[PDB]
Amino acid sequence: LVPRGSHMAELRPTAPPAFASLFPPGLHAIYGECRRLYPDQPNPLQVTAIVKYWLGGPDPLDYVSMYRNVGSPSANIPEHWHYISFGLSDLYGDNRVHEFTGTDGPSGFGFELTFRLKRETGESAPPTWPAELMQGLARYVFQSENTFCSGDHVSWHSPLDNSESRIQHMLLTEDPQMQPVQTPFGVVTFLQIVGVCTEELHSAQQWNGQGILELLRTVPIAGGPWLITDMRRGETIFEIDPHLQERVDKGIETDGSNLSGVSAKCAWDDLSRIRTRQLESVHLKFNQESGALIPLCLRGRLLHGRHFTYKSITGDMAITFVSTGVEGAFATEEHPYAAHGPWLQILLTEEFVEKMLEDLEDLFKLPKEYSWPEKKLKVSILPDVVFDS
Template sequence: MSENNEPDFCSSGWDAISEAFEKLYPEQREPYHFGTLISWQLGGNDPLDGISVYDGGDFYHFVTYGLSELYEKESENQEYSGYGFELTVKLKKAGLRDSEAEIRCMAGILQSIARITFQNNEIFQPYEYLYTGQTTGMDAAGTSRITGFITKLDDAGEIQTPNGKVMFVELIGMQDDELKLLVEKKIQVRDILRLAPNLMCDYTRESLADKLSAESEVHV
């Protein structure tokens, strides 16, 4: 990926995403941006055409460009744009040893998740989880306890673009013991968000597994 490599032509789908985030961050007209050198359609490895990173104060707010139709309408589905969603992440700044490395790492993770959609037509929606069983952290050094994600609707919500609806689906970093509770159906994603409504991708936070287990026992 190359930095600050936005498309040179006007594109309604792309612009709609940018406008949605400019409403959240009106003073950030030129966020940090990753573009793709060779598009997926031309044989490139990165399915996303771009990823922007906004400064949310205590966190970096990522948004993808490419899971929806950024340019002309091509799909037959008139209700939704492309796959109907774009991914977002809020990466907490506290505890990051090398912010630039972590921003690049997260951009790579978003490309990898988008690749799942492009290759398998998998649609990600709020209140789901992504569990791979990996034990190494998703941070650049691989030392954090964050190994997967849950999803919820991002602050940017859902927008109507000229190419159809686009929902912004936020990925929230989760630890292995928390994810196993979901896999074993002892809790649901909504239980986690009810217990920790302001949860984001935080590489240094303590595990919520004990609290979640206690919560599940109360509701048995």
């Protein structure tokens, strides 16, 4: 039989913008991607800086395009407003704001901010507050020269739209739609701002940024695969799902912690009986909050050959936990407890911290005391009254 043929049972830019000569080449490329995504909105609402930054203006971003993304409620992606900045990258390439660096490497700071705000009902246009937020974030970047990555966190400690909204902080990720572009003035990637609660910010600091991001992609209400910020969100991802906390802690064990130290209630005392002092025995003290970080300090820092420092909020006192892999420590295996004044350094071997972690479970009859006489070490978790005196 001669082939009858296939019968498919299931099937699912290129033209320059008006008046191209007018556009700066760096602005021209970014706009190209925006058109790719939104051909139906060729003239979107824009917030624009009339007083230019290079002429005294407070606003580093020259433009903020505001499109309407329908999303895919067909696949749990809500309707939202999409915000795209112009100014963080080298737009003009004439050394007015950014140093011209040519095609190789990053255009300006090498990125432009984006943000996806979940659309409410009655909203017949995109709200203009996130534009001002982006301006604010751009000020941070311009005043220093701290270029941001996918995974970075920003401590804002203020409701992003000045609302009562829980969402007071921001994480940064790759925009799910925007593809990095090559301008004549360098390369531009697209960092998306994702709003988060103080609690979730702390989780990213404790673990890593990328991991907390991935966690938000499985919680649509937060959340979603496209990381859309809903300002009217009331509960954290941990309150929506307590099972997630386990994946945070599991990750701290797997990847390690970004947390190098913490200002908390802590103290240490000598049992031996400025210059370095080598202590034969030591007694470390913590409240419930700082004591709760001990497993993180051991499992996610020392077990990874990194270190951890507890600083007492009141006073001179400090404790630094160190592993064998650290360089420049004045605490060695032979003299594992050493202090330069009030600053205590404790060296703990890999074999021994594993044994400690067997004793230390969550982490409540306080004082909760632990003791290893073979190491001459005592760790006690006390009520806050001790350190408040």
